Amino acid sequence: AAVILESIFLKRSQQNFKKCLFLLTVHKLSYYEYDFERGRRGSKKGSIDVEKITCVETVVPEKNPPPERQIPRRGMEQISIIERFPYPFQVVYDEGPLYVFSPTEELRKRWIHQLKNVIRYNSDLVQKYHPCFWIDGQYLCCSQTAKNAMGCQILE
Numbered sequence: 001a002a003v004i005l006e007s008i009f010l011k012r013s014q015q016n017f018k019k020c021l022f023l024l025t026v027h028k029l030s031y032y033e034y035d036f037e038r039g040r041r042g043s044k045k046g047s048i049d050v051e052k053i054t055c056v057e058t059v060v061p062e063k064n065p066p067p068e069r070q071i072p073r074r075g076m077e078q079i080s081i082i083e084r085f086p087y088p089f090q091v092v093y094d095e096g097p098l099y100v101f102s103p104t105e106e107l108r109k110r111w112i113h114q115l116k117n118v119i120r121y122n123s124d125l126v127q128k129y130h131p132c133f134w135i136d137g138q139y140l141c142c143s144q145t146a147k148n149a150m151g152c153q154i155l156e
Ligand SMILES: O=C1Cc2cc(Cl)ccc2N1
Pocket: 011, 012, 013, 014, 029, 030, 031, 046, 047, 048, 098
């Protein structure tokens, strides 16, 4: 149907970070190049059928992030909201987890809430998720060295 949410997010490529336009509908989560000059979404780079999503949760953030992903001291500025992306969340599907970084806690919340809504009736929703990122061939949370490894932490 229509776009539920449209945001510019920093996403981690399949093992590099890219700044992309993300669109959510009841059918698809998709991502696009952003045409900054014309102020429009550019060419589609990927799509995930919502029915394939098994898990959407927050990700324990990086220990030593670059400035682009540093969490500011607590408490909308035009530059910061397209330059800084320190709040990460994970979308889990058949082809492993996708890591998306939001510029604000509120934007990440909006996305996690709307994604949990659109996936609510999916057949393969999981009871366990990975609180930490997959990095250098292993999950930091449980040291498991397979991306499709069952979640090491039970969802509350
Ligand atoms: O590396 C990536 C980033 C991405 C986003 C989406 Cl929505 C789908 C697939 C992929 N693969």
